Design a protein around this ligand. Structure first.
Ligand SMILES: *[C@@H]1O[C@H](CO)[C@@H](O[C@@H]2O[C@H](CO)[C@@H](O[C@@H]3O[C@H](CO[C@H]4O[C@H](CO)[C@@H](O)[C@H](O)[C@@H]4O)[C@@H](O)[C@H](O)[C@@H]3O)[C@H](O)[C@H]2NC(C)=O)[C@H](O)[C@H]1NC(C)=O
Ligand SMILES: *[C@@H]1O[C@H](CO)[C@@H](O[C@@H]2O[C@H](CO)[C@@H](O[C@@H]3O[C@H](CO)[C@@H](O)[C@H](O)[C@@H]3O)[C@H](O)[C@H]2NC(C)=O)[C@H](O)[C@H]1NC(C)=O
Lengths: 48, 34, 81
């Protein structure tokens, strides 16, 4: 969301996902643990 | 409160306090020997 | 995240940062580097699971205090007995 307010700021996509999960009140530890599962589910939903 | 229940609450500092007590200088190990 | 003793430490808030020489944590919206310590971060799991983690020591504020008390007690009651 950085560039929205102005200058764009490079960030890792995983870091962004962790920040979103914090936004919905979820700990990033699970996200890091299950990166593979989240990515697979996301890709499957995209195909669907 | 209503419906509160029973359970001990752990103190994370407690194990370190116990270790400090056990191995502080020589108390309880060699100070008490004489 | 970071590994100190085979365990994964993560920032409570902010983000880790390192321009080489050293590692710090700071609030995301302002460059305020800070020493990473126990209170700054929190533990979760071990190292292997995550991807891209690196290594660094995590300082404990309590340790130097109890070390001062150790200097007072451990090495003063030495030879009187
Ligand atoms: C980008 O590199 C900068 C180079 O300075 C980082 O500066 C930070 O500044 C603090 C102190 O103001 C350092 O903490 C101590 O710094 C003193 C002296 O400061 C500088 O010089 C030493 C070498 O004499 C160097 O090691 C320092 O890093 C500083 O460059 C040192 O004598 C101490 O040993 C201790 O380092 C920080 O360590 C230093 N951080 C880093 C990564 O070097 C600035 O933090 C850097 N920015 C980011 C986001 O990491
Ligand atoms: C951060 O610290 C850890 C623990 O030291 C580093 O792990 C390193 O991983 C490699 C591969 O496992 C180790 O090399 C060899 O691994 C085999 C199989 O486990 C083992 O039998 C050998 O004895 C040897 O350990 C390596 O020893 C191990 N330690 C180091 C200093 O490389 C990790 O690479 C470090 N850096 C990070 C996470 O960025």
């Amino acid at each position: 969301w950085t560039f929205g307010a102005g200058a764009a700021l490079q960030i890792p996509f995983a870091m962004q996902m962790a920040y979103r999960f914090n936004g919905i009140g979820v700990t990033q530890n699970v996200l890091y643990e299950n990166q593979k599962l989240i990515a697979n589910q996301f890709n499957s939903a995209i195909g669907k | 409160v209503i419906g509160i229940v029973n359970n001990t609450v752990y103190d994370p500092l407690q194990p370190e306090l116990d270790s400090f007590k056990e191995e502080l200088d020589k108390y309880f190990k060699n100070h008490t020997s004489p | 995240a970071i590994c100190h003793d085979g365990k994964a430490h993560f920032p409570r808030e902010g983000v880790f940062v390192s321009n080489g020489t050293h590692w710090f944590v700071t609030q995301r919206n302002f460059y305020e580097p800070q020493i990473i310590t126990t209170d700054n971060t929190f533990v979760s799991g071990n190292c292997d699971v995550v991807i891209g983690i690196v290594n660094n020591t995590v300082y404990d504020p309590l340790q130097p205090e109890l070390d001062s008390f150790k200097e007072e007690l451990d090495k003063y009651f030495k030879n009187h007995t």
